[PDB]
């Protein structure tokens, strides 16, 4: 199926012919170098990569021959280390002789600290470290998604608290609508799973499948969604049957919440006449677990939320909570999924507070904004060789030498270099061996991942 | 392997309970809308059709898996088990939809229908909305192929003006985006899209995709060359950079070799090492295997200009027929840092002002070519435009299209998208859209050779 001998940058293929004689070790590391400032990042995703692509017998005679042919044509010359891959196949039954150490999945670590390290375990495979860089560095994506998601969660927790006095339901405040905005099916799954580290709402079940497959969970409902009615289905009934459309929907989905666009024809007539009275007997009767969620009209993200809230406020009973903020009845809520990114989320929620509107009233959705438009540059994700051993001599190639992560008694994180960690300075290394010679040596359930990524 | 019943936005799962009774048709379309990148390269649909939609994609096992997944996901039974079983029993699991599209590789101006989708069996009215997700992801290869072609245009302009021809244009932009994209699948798709316009890529997966889903007569559709970076050269120590260089050039002499030159000494490497010390091993390299020098970091233009100058003094520089400086055939430069469509223009412009032929330099694009792209760059939009209920028809950015769409060209060759089925009259040339998928079968397929031909630049 997938061939790891063909999963590296092409130029790295020739590295086994570029090192000095007797090079026995190449040690490399990944960090989110320093440079809404993302001060701390969530380390998430390496486990997926290790399990899906690196563990077990990943080298076969068949795969060796495939790579030899592919590369012969690619470089128009035989520059493929066939013998080197044959050694791995025969010596370790196709298992990769490398060791990867990393901070636990879900850990929140400030920028500029070692997150994981990679090195070969057999001197003959000094070239392997550079080779697997490509596959490992893609962990930047789930790290970045989990990080940007958590930052948005911090914004939501702050205002939810100040406006309601608590954080109940925080986990359902930001929904992942990024399926259609990402670059591939695989990316959709990875990204959705990274969002689920922080929240539970997603429209990409592939995220849940990845979690259950690569991490494991005891959580009864790790990821959820609610039926949603959009323009495409409502307008199919016609302007004269919008009421029938609305009644049909709410009656079809009465035991769970339901999202319905109010912008199909006229939000006023829809909220004031249809919802307001014509079908009122179907709304007020809904449980607090299955509220009607109104998806505001098109326009400015903040303005629209207020407008719809003010309208609804005029037709339904609003009350002030213990914190003194306007709160719609339990059977009625609002969702803003258009133009909501990390920066805009701020202004929106900010405006709501200043207008006496509680955050309990609204939830948000983000699409290609939280799964796409993100790059390695956001957190300055960097992978580099920091230590090499040639002719028995240890040399430093960014951070220098062998690295280790530590947390001081004051609760600060520090990455010690040049093997200084060996001096047992600041306790024990926080990086743990997760992969060694083809075997995943330490794994985490998704429950642990979420616990480690929890808000401070 | 893959369960298409689980590959749609969640909220679309319940649509089979949202339409009026006897809704028999749902017709939707895809376009790169314009406001108020003038042309896009349509590429990638065929990969999706063949990999995910064709053949028997529904099985009892998949239907059951979906039922369980959605029951937990929605906390209620809102999965159309009956509707999917119907496809399994009536069409042996083949999807009853028809997709029409402009040819793969075709160049179409913005604001025009590119592909359409509709159910072929009235009982499957709900299927059109369902597959939107998987089909709209074509926005990615479309965008990559389009952006890549725009850069090709810039390079073509300056290569022609500075050398007189476009020889070797296909090797001027190398794809180094493997490490900068979000996944393995995305790497392959993206690399394939770049290969629509160029041949250099460091992602062999892109070539695999081309051969598997398109096919080619080209004996070498994608290529790369050995390259030496800092992590490998610095391993030798500052005092052995010359040996590192010597070793590498000797190792790879029948093929071109890329070598970083800013490890330690930037001037000494070009002047002394490459010059006085190893010149004998460079001037001897054939024109098919030149030494490729990769410049230091910093401003991309300044660095390119500074490197050419240093070399241009230690090596014999000529003057082509257009009067621009040209390095000897065994020596070239590559700039793979900080290059995107905006920076590319500034660089080639700078070289022209400095009288340097574009022949001397090639470029590399990474994350800024396969990741710094979104659906909004080209305003990729998918929308329902026609619906039939009870046997009756129903219906910032430019307005959306309505009714049955068709693509044509005026006698002047101007592209026009006709709406409300007006295309039936064929006032202009018949519909340019072709049926590429129908009831589980891919009905029209393009070789990557046709794709590249359709995407060629306009000589004008």
Swiss-Prot record, chain A:
Pfam families from the UniProt entry: NAMPT_N, NAPRTase
Matches recorded under Gene3D superfamilies: Aldolase class I
Catalytic activity reported: beta-nicotinamide D-ribonucleotide + diphosphate = 5-phospho-alpha-D-ribose 1-diphosphate + nicotinamide + H(+)
Residues that bear Phosphotyrosine: 172
GO molecular function: cytokine activity; heterocyclic compound binding; identical protein binding; nicotinamide phosphoribosyltransferase activity; nucleotide binding
Record-listed diphosphate binding positions: 180, 231, 295
Annotated pathway: Cofactor biosynthesis; NAD(+) biosynthesis; nicotinamide D-ribonucleotide from 5-phospho-alpha-D-ribose 1-diphosphate and nicotinamide: step 1/1
EC numbers, comma separated: 2.4.2.12
Binding site for beta-nicotinamide D-ribonucleotide: 203, 295-297, 337-338, 368, 376
Phosphoserine PTM sites in chain numbering: 445
GO annotation, cellular component aspect: cytoplasm; extracellular space; nucleus
Localization per record: Nucleus; Cytoplasm; Secreted
CDD domains for the chain: PBEF_like
Tissue: Expressed in various tissues. At the highest level in liver and at the second highest in heart. The amount is higher in heart than in lung.
Domain of life of the organism encoding this protein: Eukaryota
InterPro entries in alphabetical order: Aldolase_TIM (IPR013785), DUF5598 (IPR041529), N/Namide_PRibTrfase (IPR041525), Nicotinamide_PRibTrfase (IPR016471), Nicotinate_pribotase-like_C (IPR036068)
Keyword field contains Lipid metabolism: no
Keywords of this entry: Acetylation, Biological rhythms, Cytokine, Cytoplasm, Glycosyltransferase, Nucleus, Phosphoprotein, Pyridine nucleotide biosynthesis, Secreted, Transferase
Function (record text): Catalyzes the condensation of nicotinamide with 5-phosphoribosyl-1-pyrophosphate to yield nicotinamide mononucleotide, an intermediate in the biosynthesis of NAD. It is the rate limiting component in the mammalian NAD biosynthesis pathway. The secreted form behaves both as a cytokine with immunomodulating properties and an adipokine with anti-diabetic properties, it has no enzymatic activity, partly because of lack of activation by ATP, which has a low level in extracellular space and plasma. Plays a role in the modulation of circadian clock function.
Assembly, per entry: Homodimer.
Family: Belongs to the NAPRTase family.
Annotated protein name in UniProt: Nicotinamide phosphoribosyltransferase
UniProt gene name: Nampt
């Amino acid at each position: 199926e997938f061939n790891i001998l063909l999963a590296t940058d092409s130029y790295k293929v020739t590295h086994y012919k570029q090192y000095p004689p007797n090079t026995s070790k190449v040690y490399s590391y990944f960090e989110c170098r320093e440079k809404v400032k993302y001060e701390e990042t969530v380390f998430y995703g390496l486990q997926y990569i290790l399990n899906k692509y690196l563990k077990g017998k990943v080298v076969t005679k068949e795969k060796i021959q495939e790579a030899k042919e592919v590369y012969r044509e690619h470089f128009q010359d035989d520059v493929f280390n066939e013998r080197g891959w044959n050694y791995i196949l025969e010596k370790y039954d196709g298992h990769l002789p490398i060791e990867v150490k990393a901070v636990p999945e879900g850990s929140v670590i400030p920028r500029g600290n070692v997150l994981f390290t990679v090195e070969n375990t057999d001197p003959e495979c000094y070239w392997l470290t550079n080779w697997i860089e490509t596959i490992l560095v893609q962990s930047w994506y789930p790290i970045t998604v989990a990080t940007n998601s958590r930052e948005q969660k911090k914004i939501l927790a702050k205002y939810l608290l100040e406006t309601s006095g608590n954080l109940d339901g925080l986990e359902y405040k930001l929904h992942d609508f990024g399926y259609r905005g990402v670059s591939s099916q695989e990316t959709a799954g990875i990204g959705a799973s990274a969002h689920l580290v922080n929240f539970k709402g997603t429209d990409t079940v592939a995220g849940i499948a990845l979690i259950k497959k690569y991490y494991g969970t005891k959580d009864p409902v790790p990821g959820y969604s609610v039926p949603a009615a959009e323009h495409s289905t409502i307008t199919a009934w016609g302007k004269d049957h919008e009421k029938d459309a609305f009644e049909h929907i709410v009656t079809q989905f009465s035991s769970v919440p339901v999202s319905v666009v109010s912008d199909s024809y006229d939000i006023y007539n829809a909220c004031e006449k249809i919802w307001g009275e014509d079908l009122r007997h179907l709304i007020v009767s809904r449980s607090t677990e299955a509220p009607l969620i109104i998806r505001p009209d098109s326009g400015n993200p903040l303005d629209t939320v207020l407008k719809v809230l003010d309208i609804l406020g005029k037709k339904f009973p609003v009350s002030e909570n213990s914190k003194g903020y306007k709160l719609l009845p339990p059977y009625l809520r609002v969702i803003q999924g258009d133009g909501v990114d990390i920066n805009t989320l701020q202004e929106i929620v900010e405006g709501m507070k200043q207008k006496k509107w509680s955050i309990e009233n609204v939830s948000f959705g983000s699409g290609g904004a939280l799964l796409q438009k993100l790059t390695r540059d956001l957190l300055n994700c960097s992978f580099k060789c920091s230590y090499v051993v040639t002719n028995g001599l240890g040399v430093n190639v960014s951070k220098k030498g062998r690295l280790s992560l530590h947390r001081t008694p004051a609760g600060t994180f520090v990455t010690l270099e040049e093997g200084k960690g060996d001096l047992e300075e600041y306790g024990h290394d926080l990086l743990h061996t997760v992969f060694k010679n083809g075997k995943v040596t330490k794994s985490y359930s998704f429950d642990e991942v979420r616990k480690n990524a929890q808000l401070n």
